[PDB]
Amino acid sequence: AIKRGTVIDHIPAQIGFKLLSLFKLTETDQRITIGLNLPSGEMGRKDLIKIENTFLSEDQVDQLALYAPQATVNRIDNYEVVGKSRPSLPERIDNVLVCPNSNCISHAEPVSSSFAVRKRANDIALKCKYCEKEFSHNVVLAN
Amino acid sequence: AIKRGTVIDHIPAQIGFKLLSLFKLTETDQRITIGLNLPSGEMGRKDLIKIENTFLSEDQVDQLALYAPQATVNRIDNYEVVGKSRPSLPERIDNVLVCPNSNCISHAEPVSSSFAVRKRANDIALKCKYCEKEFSHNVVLAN
Amino acid sequence: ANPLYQKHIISINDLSRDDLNLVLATAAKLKANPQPELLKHKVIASAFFEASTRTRLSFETSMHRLGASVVGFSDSANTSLGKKGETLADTISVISTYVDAIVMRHPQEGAARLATEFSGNVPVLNAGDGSNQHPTQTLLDLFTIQETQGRLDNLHVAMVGDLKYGRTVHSLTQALAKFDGNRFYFIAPDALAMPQYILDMLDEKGIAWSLHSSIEEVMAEVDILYMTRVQKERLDPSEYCNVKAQFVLRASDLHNAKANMKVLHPLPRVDEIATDVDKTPHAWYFQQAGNGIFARQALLALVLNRDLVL
Amino acid sequence: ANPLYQKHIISINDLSRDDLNLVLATAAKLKANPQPELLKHKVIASAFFEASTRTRLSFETSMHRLGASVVGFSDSANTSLGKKGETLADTISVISTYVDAIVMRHPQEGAARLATEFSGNVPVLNAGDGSNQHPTQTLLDLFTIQETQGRLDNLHVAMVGDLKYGRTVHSLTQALAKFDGNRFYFIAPDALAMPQYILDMLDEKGIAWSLHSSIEEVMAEVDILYMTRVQKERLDPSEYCNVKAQFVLRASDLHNAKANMKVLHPLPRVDEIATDVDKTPHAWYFQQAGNGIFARQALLALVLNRDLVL
Amino acid sequence: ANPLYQKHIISINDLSRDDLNLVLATAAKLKANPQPELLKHKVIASAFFEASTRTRLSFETSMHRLGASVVGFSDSANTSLGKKGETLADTISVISTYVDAIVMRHPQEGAARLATEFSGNVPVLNAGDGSNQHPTQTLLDLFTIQETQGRLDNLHVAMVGDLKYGRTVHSLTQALAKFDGNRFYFIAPDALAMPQYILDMLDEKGIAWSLHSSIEEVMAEVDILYMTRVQKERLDPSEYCNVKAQFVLRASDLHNAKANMKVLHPLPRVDEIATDVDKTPHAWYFQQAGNGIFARQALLALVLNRDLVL
Ligand SMILES: [Zn+2]
Ligand SMILES: [Zn+2]
């Protein structure tokens, strides 16, 4: 609850700090409020972020379906939630992740990473544009 | 405010996130609350951290002296501040940092990092307990 | 302008059934009637950053058969990249200003793909990128399979050996699974099992496959027995138990093979096929190899010549 | 019979302005109108006793474009000279009885010169002799410079990096100083300073040059920023401090460049040019590289064909 | 129980002026009046992970001259840390259940401090840990200055060579700075400058120190000329230029030296001291070395024997 901005609710425990680091969120002059380990009737234990006078992209909001799937992004204007988006999985993710295949060409060369995203039984599959191998998103680390 | 715990007030903007990473503070099931870029009990902009059911030894608080010397730490019990302490320069910093010297015995072996802290002109110097070299606090990265 | 004119050939997964068929057709047409001045005034790069005999020699040979010239290198040891430490991109940023198409094989997965991003309007033909893909092997594999079997659909194909690191079988399984009603048998040590990504693909396409642990289990069901070499030089330390072959095909093992069945092998073989199989009417790997000439001639004609060869 | 017919191309210092101009002219003429059967029935040696990618591949490519054949070797490891210990002279005493011209690069300064003394009526084209000369690089350098700048005279050229061992800049400074009113800026560690012999030459020709210690000092004055790689493999022990680059060009450093200025680099680059320069309108090294084809085609046509190509 | 009984001897920086004097005083007593069996029934570890001649040999000789037994290794090559990659920790943890004291040299800085953390009530004597400290070299140095200038206060002391990686000059400066009004001359290549921490400490104690580019500026007013060796095996790539001795003392250089001044060197020396210095009256490096026996007997006696010597 604030004048205008974004509230990301229902982030899972231990993810909140991550997203802070990830999207260089803390790198503004804006007011940010962060609760870690809040009780949550909804899920179980939850994290929660509020950035004032700041909004999320669309993909940035979907590139969020990876870690915070059942998260809810509220667009807030004049103290009233005027929007309620949800992260849906993108087709792909570029620049941000790193291929777990140590022999992938991506490591050595002047190229941004890139993976294909398809929902699997228990997880999310990531297929690298280059070495064409597929990994669980759990396996894949970030950079 | 919280019932029982510690409250770190008067952290200079942009340090809050640093302290949250460097000391692995969100690595807990305990309920934490954080505000980035706030107007101050004193100054103009200010960061702030509250962590439930958690306390800092006078040494833990001194550790802050290198990143937020003006910070104030309030010990909270029953919603009341029962204690109020301030960071003074410590003798040492154990565990947190890694010695910049690549040939230090501290890397391969099973021991914790450790430096002596002293003020050296307009800067703090760190001398590794092991290799005995000296570095400016600015160069010595965290784990 | 034929569908494949100026296309990179990086990965089977990027090619339609129509495309494969088109290569095979174009192929036999040229084996029927050589066209020896087709790629006259073309200079092609034969850029092998890792060892090859069949793949390279067949390619350069095909280039000549079509009347093109070849510049290249057979290892990276005596390039700027080996001795002076140059990126692949930079390397592909200059050569691509020299030649009309780049045939290249590289030790890392994804290298041919990367080259396309720096190669400009110059096509790249992937001659093998790490343990990933091997489009041109597959093209000949297909050709050989049509040659000896009559069709590319409704076959019982067994693949045996290192299925994890064998780029050969990755490309071939993807290719075959673009045709109707093929069925697979995979015979591999658990450590070199066919990767989950090929399997998931078979499943989505609703294609029958099963694992086995001996050749005999499936012998009598098989139309094509595709043997593979263990990729010693691509292994990880925790896999050195698997260096020696796990399945050795002998002539005695061919007692119950259907009459039509051919034994293939992309080659080279260590011992996964004993030399006493060479003489049987089932051995077809050398014949298979010789088919690399027509597959590759085809591919080159298609990619660098606008209009189909009649 | 054109002035360059049957001439060894060993060293810029042995060539007139008229000569350079003549290569550049002959060049563009063939880029305009290819002449693909010009050197038909010619066999050329591509004799690389040390690693090359651009220099070699461009040369062999050019030979093909003009319709000649190529025999050669890409390192000395598998010759008689490497394994059997043979002199260069003996080596050049036999090959010269085989081919119609010898393109060669060697690790020792003076090697191409030495070859002419044993090569008979066969021309030698120096593709790089130790840290000495690089006539053909210079020819393309020139071409690239005319291409992008309009002239070869009255230019502000900066050369940066290893100036002591860089054969590239030795030949290029000698070439440019045969044209009117060019001015040089040399940016090098003191240990790899441009050698006294190039300087003494500039002075006798009354040519303005000066040392600097940063790129910025001169940035805004420069028409051509010619970056060079540190010749790691040519260093002496007392110079190993200089292995890493001393001047790293970034895109941010191009704030104040005159609009016309191009960044050149004979390549390969280590880090003396960060990859973020590639995208700017000042980067012209890959384009530069591609120009090796027309410079070398030209040179070959000129040396092995009596009468000028129209 | 004297102040050094059972104490770790790791860094000069953790020792008092009285500590040092205690050792020297003891040294004399033992030299004048030996005590062949003062350390009977003791077994000592001589653990040298990096190479050693003087430091290991002198030390083991001390142990025998006092009646103790030695076990160890001169090379971490044949240990279970050398062929089986044991942690230096585990290594100390087991050795310290075998012996009454450990003398160790190690390539990593801080190795000795770390061992104290794993040896329990078994003392550890640093025999050199990478580029950090060399305590027992400082003690024989001190004994040697003492015996040749008759004091440790108010000396003009020059240090030449590699001061950055010189564990020898790190300990000796910290020890001399513990006495009064000693003045220092640091002569060395910029890249191998005496470390900031040593300078800060001198400053803090208000001790006069100054830099110089040659030996002749200071030669007239020096009492101890202390030459060192460029520590090539500890150099960084960017420093490999400095391998060669930059200051070479030779007998003619000693012409206007003081009658009393001695040339010292921890040894070994490369070329930094020409052999013509060897016969001059100023040469004292070999005497220096021989003095190690006394300082090391002394040190060993105090650490291992409860009651002061007589
Ligand atoms: Zn990858
Ligand atoms: Zn350290």
Residues facing D105 on adjacent strands: D48
Q: Is B104 known as a binding-site position?
A: yes
**Cβ atoms C186, C215 nearer than 8 A:** no
Examine the domain organization and report whether A95 and A85 are in the same domain.
no
Neighbours of E98 (CB within 10 A): 11
Pairing of strands C69-73, C43-48: parallel
Q: Do chains A and E touch (3 or more CB pairs under 8 A)?
A: no
Eight-class DSSP state of B102: T
Amino acid at A134: E
What's the rounded Cα separation, in Å, for the pair A132 and A129?
6
Q: Please indicate whether, in this complex, the C-beta atoms of E197 and B133 are within 8 angstroms of each other.
A: yes
Tokens of C299: 């591919």
- In sign, the C-alpha dihedral spanning C269, C275, C276, C279 is positive
Which of D206, D175, D170 lies closest to D188 in space, CA to CA? D170
B99 is in an annotated binding site: yes
Contact D196, D253 (CB under 8 A): no
Residue B132 near chain E (CB below 8 Å): yes
Domain endpoint, select from B45, B71, B90: B90
State whether C106 and A110 contact (CB < 8 Å).
Answer: no
Q: C134 an active-site residue?
A: yes
* Residue B128, helix vs strand vs coil: strand
C7 is annotated as an active-site residue: no
Bridge partner residues of D104 (DSSP): D47, D126
Greatest CA separation found in chain A? 52
Q: How far apart, in whole angstroms, are the C-alpha atoms of residue C280 and residue C285?
A: 12
Rg, chain A, Cα only: 16
- What does the H/E/C string look like for chain E? CCCCCCCCECCHHHCCHHHHHHHHHHHHHHHHCCCCCCCCCCEEEEEECCCCCHHHHHHHHHHHHCCCEEEEECCCCCCCCCCCCCCHHHHHHHHCCCCCEEEEEECCECHHHHHHCCCCCCCEEEEEECCCCCHHHHHHHHHHHHHHHCCCCCCEEEEECCCCCCHHHHHHHHHHCCCCCCEEEEECCHHHCCCHHHHHHHHHCCCCEEEECCCCCCHHHCCEEEECCCCHHHCCHHHHHHHCCCCCECHHHHCCCCCCCEEECCCCCCCCECHHHCCCCCECHHHHHHHHHHHHHHHHHHHHCCCCCC
Best residue in B105, B111, B113 for a mutation probing chain E (most E CBs within 10 Å): B105
- How far is it, in rounded angstroms, from Cα E178 to Cα E135? 14
Is residue B40 domain-shared with residue B98, that is, in the same domain? no
Calculate the dihedral angle through the C-alpha atoms of C202, C204, C207, C210, rounding to the nearest 10 degrees.
60
Residue B135: domain span: 91-143
Chain E residues close to D239, C-beta within 8 Å = 241
Please indicate whether, in this complex, the C-beta atoms of E239 and D238 are within 8 angstroms of each other. no
Helices (H), D37-183: 54-65, 80-83, 88-95, 111-116, 135-149, 167-176
Quick one: which ligand is closest to B98's CA? 2
**Residue A80 vs residues A32, A34, C196, E214: alpha-carbon distances, Å:** 18, 19, 48, 78
CB-CB contact of E199 with E226 (8 Å): no
The number of angstroms, rounded, from the C-alpha of E48 to the middle of its chain's C-alpha atoms is 15
How far is Cα E139 from Cα E300, in angstroms, rounded to an integer? 12
For C71, the closest of D61, D229, D270 (CB atoms) is D61
First to last CA, chain E: 14
**Ligand 2 center–CA B136 separation, angstroms:** 13
Q: Residue A59 is encoded by which pair of tokens?
A: 């993909």
With tokens 């302008």, the residue in question is: C1
CB D274 within 8 A of CB D214: no
Characterize A31-48 residue by residue with b for buried, 16 or more Cβ atoms within 10 angstroms of its Cβ, and e for exposed.
Answer: bbbbbbbbebeeeeebbb
> Do residue B70 and residue B121 come from a single domain?
no
Name the token pair of D96.
């010269």
Residue C309 has which token pair? 């060869």
Dist CA B130 CA B139 (whole Å)? 17
Do B61 and B123 belong to one domain? no
* Local structure of residue A91 (DSSP, 8 states): S
Q: In angstroms, rounded to a whole number, what is the distance separating the alpha carbons of residues D77 and C231?
A: 27
Query: Distance between terminal CA atoms of chain B?
Result: 31
The beta strand positions in C74-123, using DSSP E, are 101-106
| A89, amino acid identity | L
Specify the pairing of strand A32-39 against strand A45-52. antiparallel
- Experimental method reported for this structure: X-ray
The reply to whether B85 and B38 lie within a common domain is yes
Domains, chain E: 1-133+292-310 (3.40.50.1370), 134-291 (3.40.50.1370)
**Across the A/B interface, how many CB contacts are shorter than 8 Å?**
54
Distances (CA, A) of C118 to A111, C100, D276, D280, D301: 10, 14, 14, 16, 30
Distance CA C30, CA D200 (A): 64
Mutual angle of helices D135-149 and D167-176, in 10-degree steps: 60
Cα(E4)–Cα(C261) distance, integer angstroms: 87
- Please indicate, yes or no, whether residues A63 and A127 belong to a single structural domain of this protein: no
CB atoms within 10 A of CB B72: 18
Distances (CA, A) of A29 to A12, B36, B38: 26, 8, 9
β-bridge pairing D101-106 and D43-48: parallel
Partnered with residue D261 across adjacent β-strands are none
What are the tokens at D2? 């054109």
Residues A86 and A99 in one domain: no
The rounded distance, in Å, linking the Cα atoms of D252 and D275 is: 12
Point out the domain boundary residue: B46, B70, B90: B90
CATH code, A31: 3.30.70.140
Shared-domain flag, residues B115 and B80: no
Separation CA C74–CA C57 (nearest Å) = 10
Phi and psi at B90, nearest 5°, equal -85, 170
Q: How far is the CA of B133 from the centre of ligand 2 (A)?
A: 6
Residues B78 and B142 in one domain: no
Which of E41, E84, E279, E306 is catalytic? The answer is E84
- Which of C119, C11, C9 shows the shortest CA–CA distance to A116? C11
Answer whether B36 sits within 8 Å of A33, measured CB to CB. yes
Torsion of CA E62, E68, E74, E77, to 10 degrees: -160
Distance between CA atoms of residues E140 and E291, nearest Å: 6
Of C228, C202, C270, C215, nearest in space to C131 by CA:
C228
Q: Contact A90/A59 with Cβ under 8 angstroms? A: yes
Q: Is the four-CA dihedral C78, C56, D300, C122 of positive or negative sign?
A: negative
Rounded to the nearest angstrom, the distance between the alpha carbon of D133 and the centre of ligand 2 is 48
Does an interface of 3+ CB pairs under 8 Å exist between C and D?
Answer: yes
Residues 6+ positions from D199 with CB-CB distance below 8 Å:
D209
> Which residue from A minimizes the CA distance to C117?
A111
Distance from C-alpha of C154 to C-alpha of C164, rounded to nearest angstrom: 25
Strands C124-129 and C101-106: parallel
8-state DSSP, C253:
G
Task: Report angle CA A121, C15, C97 to the nearest 5 degrees.
Answer: 120
The partner residues of D47 in beta bridges, in order of sequence, read: D73, D104
Lookup: tokens for B19: 């302290």
Residue A105: DSSP 8-state:
G
Do A63 and A113 share a domain, yes or no? no
Sign of the alpha-carbon torsion through E299, E301, E303, E306: negative
Half-sphere exposure in the Cβ direction for D84 (13 Å, CA): 9
Q: Is D107 exposed, middle or buried (0-12, 13-18, 19+ CB in 10 A)?
A: middle
At D29, give phi and psi (nearest 5°): -55, -40
The total of structural domains in chain B comes to 2
Q: Would you give the DSSP letter of residue C246? A: S
Q: In what helix (H) or strand (E) does residue C202 lie, and over which residues does it extend? A: helix C196-204
Q: Which residue out of E86, E114, E203 would a mutagenesis test of the B interface target, given it has the greatest number of B Cβ atoms within 10 Å?
A: E114
Short-list E59, E129, E17, E35, CA closest to E299: E59
Rounded to whole angstroms, the Cα distance separating D101 from D121 reads: 9
Cβ of residue A112 closer than 8 Å to a chain C Cβ = no
* Distance of residue A70 Cα from the nearest chain B Cα, in angstroms: 20
Of A64, A90, A116, the one marking the end of a domain is: A90
Which of A101, A109, A133 lies closest to C89 in CB terms? A109
**Nearest to residue E262, comparing CAs of E150, E172, E187?**
E150
- Closest by CA position to C129, among listed C9, C1, C295: C9
Same domain, A16 and A78: yes
Ligand nearest to the CA of B107: 2
B44 — contact with chain E (CB < 8 Å)? no
Nearest alpha-carbon partner for B11 in B50, B56, B54 = B50
Q: Which residue has the tokens 């009646």?
A: E67
| Residues of chain B contacting residue A36, judged by C-beta atoms under 8 Å apart | 26, 31-34
Using the beta-carbon criterion (under 8 Å), do E242 and D243 form an inter-chain contact?
no
Binding-site sequence positions of E: 54-55, 84, 105, 134, 137, 167, 229, 267-268
Q: How far apart are CA D301 and CA C291, in angstroms?
A: 39
CA distance D58 to D134: 14
Residues B80 and B95 placed together within one structural domain of the fold:
no
Using CB atoms, list chains with 3+ pairs below 8 Å to chain A. B, C
